[PDB]
Symmetry: D2
Subunit: 389 residues, 4 copies
């Protein structure tokens, strides 16, 4: 029986998944995708590409309605009628949306055709993750929609400039993306929520702090850690939590509105909040670690180089710049890192960088790679430690 | 070891897939998708929704470049540089596109970092399947991009009318989709190619023609099969191929430009090409089978009913209307049929119909269901045989 | 490809086995056996039954030669010639024995046609486990060889009596097995070694000792645990190890030659060694637990009842008799417990007992079951706690 | 859940087994055995070796009772009581035997504790396969039981002589096995039934007869095929069935009592029955094929050589001796061929032979190997074609 075979595959892959760690589960998931793509018929390939688009549109509708938050806190299954009436949605529309969501596990449909939350329901109810989905819909979709004709009309240029990529066509503007976004209050508000998401694991799981410090002295009033564009300060928080007795100032640098949003959740002491624009010279002199997490991927080389050149003059011989970012391999890169590469090309003019590309960029700033500490697999994020050449 | 476990999973799934038929492979593939969604982390869920969008955009670029057709006819692996120079693409852009494509199996990357075709490459090189992907990009994505704000602005109405859905917002028109498309030659050209795709399997794999025929006589000069909106006439061609000895007229009905396109590949004899607008009364009297394949799903009830009411007066007691279309279940419907439902709601105002919904529609035309012959699984397509009530 | 499928099956089963515990691995192993028997051809079934016999005979030869102990301490693969010369075996005989052993994993053969130890090699090198294999060869096989003609000659009687079973035919004696064995020094010597094997896990893994103890007082000088026929005293040793702070006498009871063998490995204090024949009245009065592990399975009902009736008069109201033995289910019993049943029927006239059969036996002694604490699965061993009725 | 995992393993291995051929299923079965042996605990290893012995003893009892034949023709499940009364067995004995048989799939136990035939029940009801099991019990078991002490008392000699192996100790005789068996009427009767079993597949599935014949002419009255020790003549029958129009005499040679038993099932014409002792000179001169299937494995080299030397003088340059027998590999031999090797060593003084060992034996008769045609895997049986040197 087909049904018996399918259920047996599910049982065995679930047991295997439970028996490994998060990195092993990520490897299994990538293999399931690869299997799916190799076993689909030609028609199925086009149907998948045609319809998987629906998920973000329907998640955006569920978010607008508050459906995922509401379902995540219901204690019993809800009918489509009950959901429609509670959330202010046409009843037939709600029923069709729910049937679609259940078919892609965005909710669960029960045997009596009522609806309960799934793992994905709970995910889309989390503010920061919801904001990620909303960002995909309102910022990524339009640049991807513009990219093919942008490239066709321009005879397939290498994209190298944040002011000359698909974003300008998609939003009918000559501004670059970051400048334009700063003029759009609802879009800024969504980024504020997005910053509350904290990725796990983080670089402290493999960063050999005591080894990298050696005999470094914090006196007088030297900074241990300067978190440049640190957002809510998650890296500073985790550093203080893991090494509470390590001397040295721990400093969160960001723009004033982000620092203001960070205050409610920062510790009352031990982490300084310092307004600082990272396109301007670094004020903190001689720090041990100048930390850039998921900053430089958003900039083409010219701008990324300028960000580094604003830090290098503040370094002493013991200082290090730590770039915590994606490091895709030379070959066999996975969809999460190549897809990111295409999206940030189209919106930002930037790119994912291999280790050798990071080293070439840093050498232009007078920096040499001393160590690289991977902390996620198989898609690699790593803390790259650079010193003055 | 975890690599070894992943390779063993692939080996076993590949072997189970080869030991079943196409319907069993479709069930396995849906299971792999369900497993993937249940094993992903919350972050991975949002990453997948954010990035799976990239595939249609990049497939559209490769189609514009002629990459898939070129790679499918190459006899040896090609470097990114070779492909970029041949196709007229910036070398860095080409390399980045190819790395993304290899990561989603749109091409395959070799250990030498060169590129060969995959199953998906070959699929996207086929004109009719390529046209389906291009249709998703240029027609479906704009209406899905418009749907959430359309619904929000209108306070979530049940969509019931082809003239009042997301299409009018997406394309800034008051026309319905079909009327607007007829004014857009480049889109018309893509639909012309899309009509050359023939779906497999088809209803003749399970339709018990001799049983449904009974003792119907083709004498003196009666019509066996009238293919209403038959496109290229594939159903007529397959009918004559499978039943070469059954007498009676076999008639392809469509609009003149489509009949003209059909002529080159119709048999030289045995199939008549009759121009006929199915919004007007059916001219062929007393045919055994009036066949509507994938026609009525494109219309809301009011218009679908009109199409049926145009046929009913031509029927005699032995005539049957055969609706060949999707028949999703009452519960547990799959993503291909619910995703289709959301898309045709958004572009056409129409809907997928369960068996009970098909029967209710047909009853309004004075028709009763006699038999239903499924021919695909697990997503249901079936030939529904209706007679006069 | 079929090689690849077989390797993938091994990889997946090995991984599932490592992800569970010993009871789950035992369930997997029984499943593999059931699969083997259902997939074999009729010829293969007869070949398996004909040849699996070879394993005990060849293990007995390797034990005689000292092969398993020698190979288990070798640091490099050994050739057949090296092993034959070292152990004093004909070179061709040795090579043929080793090829047979490697084919059933009793040793492993390398790609260079040399030999190293396997898990089974190490097992057969352990004195107590080796002695179990030697017991099967010299005591069990003769009684199984005699059983079919014993039954045929006697017209298939229910075997009820230790003095009238297959043992008397096998060994040409009118003595019962236990009485005969006491006259056979080489067999006695093997049993002495077999007693040093300690089974794992044991009842203390699940026995809720503090709950069963309640408020029992060891004062003034009462007995906590009387191990009746305790052999080397493993239960006493493990009890004192797990419950080092529970007061009360812990007493090992057995016959003098066995107590003398136990002395070298008993703790220096805390466990008394008391000679006692369990066919005579229990001398220790009012103990909390009188413990019988794998004793009563060796006796038919009449004699097993006598052993219990010898203990009952020593019991006070808080005393309990704890039978630790096999408890096969009413249906679906596994080969280890039914194979044991046939063997002890044939040698000893006794039987495995279900829970209901244990309760019926104990009721004849005036005892009632209070609790049953399973500690192995799927083959059931359990500590059954009985009190005065 | 363990039960869910185990059921899923069973489902997947059954589906994989169905999807391959008989040789692939044999490979899966050997892998399941290997998995079982590597995953068992040390105690489980000794319990398996101790108890798997029970299967042949209990099958012999079921055979004596007629249980397997009776159950194989019952149309409903039978209780132990019904079986006991019908077959003349003590009721408790029958119930215990059935529980044991069900635990090793020799019968099936139902949920209401009644009994139905399994695949193995049906196998043990087939006369020739039943006779194989009975042969294992009455002829193989005693020589295996005698082998360890035979080898110990003789200081581990290479066994090379049919008159000096374990058989003489086991049966207290100076005769060799074949001579002694010919004096034992019940044992002869069992061999008569055993000869009715026909192994599948056979050498004609891969033997390129037309290629090996070339331009061979059958005139005058030449023999195509002389089946030396051909038993019931299955090889002659299959040859005539597959090549009905091939000229040349087809001759079955065996001893008179076997030829007599063969007459009832031989074709009425086209196969000659010729009494002939293969320890005497071959009477048929110049035959194309002198065929020896499973003959020479039963003889030490000296006797096997004599059998060949009785044929070689009858050969002309076109004649071939075809040895159809086991050809174990140089390394990695499987249990069915090494177990056979140990059994025939112990009973017959003979041995399994690798290809190189067959060639060394045949060269002593003045023969050279021209071709070898395998027809079973992974345990190899092959038709080896030899010509005069
Ligand atoms: C991708 S978020 C990275 C946050 C943080 N590094 C982390 O991983 O937890 C980019 C951050 O850069 C900050 N940012 C953007 N432009 C900046 C600028 N010109 N100067 C300082 N911070 C800036 C944003 O406010 C935001 O917090
Ligand atoms: C989904 S397509 C092709 C379906 C076709 N029955 C098949 O399955 O092979 C719909 C068809 O309806 C035709 N069509 C659209 N409007 C029509 C009309 N008013 N009258 C007749 N045919 C029409 C199109 O030209 C097209 O060939
Ligand atoms: C299966 S063995 C060891 C069982 C032991 N209870 C254990 O599980 O560790 C049976 C024990 O009963 C002992 N035994 C046999 N007959 C006895 C008797 N009449 N009185 C006391 N002990 C006896 C043997 O000496 C042996 O130690
Ligand atoms: C293992 S059976 C093989 C039967 C046959 N070759 C087959 O594979 O179908 C051995 C055969 O050799 C025959 N045999 C034994 N001794 C013989 C002898 N001295 N001369 C001729 N046949 C003999 C037996 O009667 C029996 O038929
Ligand atoms: C909260 C969880 C979110 C899961 C997200 C997967 C994100 C994939 C996504 C392409 C991504 O990576 C990045 C961006 O979109 C952007 C950006 C920023 C502003 C405008 C457009 C794009 C910058 N830099 C990135 O890296
Ligand atoms: C060759 C394979 C092609 C796959 C194409 C996409 C299949 C999914 C896709 C939603 C689908 O089904 C349908 C349509 O898009 C449309 C339509 C027609 C015109 C405009 C917009 C939509 C009508 N009716 C449908 O049913
Ligand atoms: C009907 C199905 C039977 C399945 C059988 C597996 C048979 C294994 C079995 C050791 C085997 O092979 C052979 C013999 O016992 C003998 C023999 C013949 C006479 C006396 C003792 C042994 C000869 N020659 C063999 O080869
Ligand atoms: C170290 C592992 C050893 C495994 C040994 C074989 C386990 C199976 C085995 C049938 C078993 O269980 C029992 C006996 O043989 C006997 C016995 C004792 C004396 C003579 C004959 C049998 C008693 N009572 C049993 O229960
Ligand atoms: Cl929101
Ligand atoms: Cl809301
Ligand atoms: Cl660390
Ligand atoms: Cl095109
Ligand atoms: Cl829009
Ligand atoms: Cl299809
Ligand atoms: Cl026909
Ligand atoms: Cl549904
Ligand atoms: Cl020993
Ligand atoms: Cl006997
Ligand atoms: Cl155990
Ligand atoms: Cl304690
Ligand atoms: Cl049972
Ligand atoms: Cl018989
Ligand atoms: Cl009988
Ligand atoms: Cl052939
Ligand atoms: Na409802
Ligand atoms: Na409608
Ligand atoms: Na009894
Ligand atoms: Na019964």
């Amino acid at each position: 029986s087909n049904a018996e075979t399918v259920a047996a595959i599910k049982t065995l892959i679930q047991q295997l998944a439970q028996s490994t760690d998060q990195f092993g589960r990520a490897e299994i998931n990538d293999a399931l995708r690869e299997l799916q793509y190799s076993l689909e018929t030609p028609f199925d390939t086009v149907m998948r590409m045609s319809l998987d688009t629906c998920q973000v549109a329907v998640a955006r509708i569920g978010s607008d309605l508050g459906l995922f938050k509401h379902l995540s806190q219901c204690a019993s299954p809800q009918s489509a009628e009950e959901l429609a009436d509670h959330l202010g949605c046409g009843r037939e529309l709600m029923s069709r949306l729910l049937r679609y969501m259940a078919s892609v596990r965005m909710v669960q449909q029960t045997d009596d055709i009522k609806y309960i939350s799934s793992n994905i329901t709970q995910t889309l109810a989390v503010p920061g993750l919801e904001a990620g989905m909303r960002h995909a819909f309102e910022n990524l979709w339009p640049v991807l929609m513009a990219l093919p004709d942008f490239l066709a009309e321009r005879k397939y240029p290498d994209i190298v400039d944040a002011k000359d990529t698909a974003f300008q066509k998609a939003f009918n503007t000559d501004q670059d993306c970051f400048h334009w976004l700063a003029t759009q209050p609802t879009r800024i508000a969504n980024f504020k929520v997005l910053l509350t998401d904290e990725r796990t694991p983080n670089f402290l799981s493999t960063f050999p702090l005591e080894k990298e410090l050696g005999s470094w002295s914090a006196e007088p009033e030297k900074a241990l850690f300067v978190d440049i564009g640190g957002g809510m300060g998650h890296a500073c928080i985790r550093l203080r939590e893991k090494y509470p007795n390590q001397p040295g100032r721990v400093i969160l640098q960001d723009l004033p509105p982000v620092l203001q949003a960070a205050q409610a959740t920062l510790p009352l002491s031990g982490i300084e909040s310092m307004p600082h624009n990272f396109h301007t010279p670094q004020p903190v002199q001689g720090a041990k670690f100048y930390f850039l997490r998921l900053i430089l991927r958003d900039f083409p080389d010219h701008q990324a180089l300028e960000i580094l050149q604003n830090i290098v003059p503040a370094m002493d011989a013991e200082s290090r710049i730590v770039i915590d970012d994606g490091v895709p391999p030379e070959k066999g890169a996975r969809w999460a890192e190549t897809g990111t590469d295409i999206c940030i090309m189209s919106a930002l003019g930037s790119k994912e960088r291999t280790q050798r590309q990071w080293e070439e960029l840093a050498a232009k700033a007078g920096l040499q790679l001393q160590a690289l500490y991977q902390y996620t697999w198989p898609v690699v994020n790593a803390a790259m430690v650079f010193s003055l050449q």
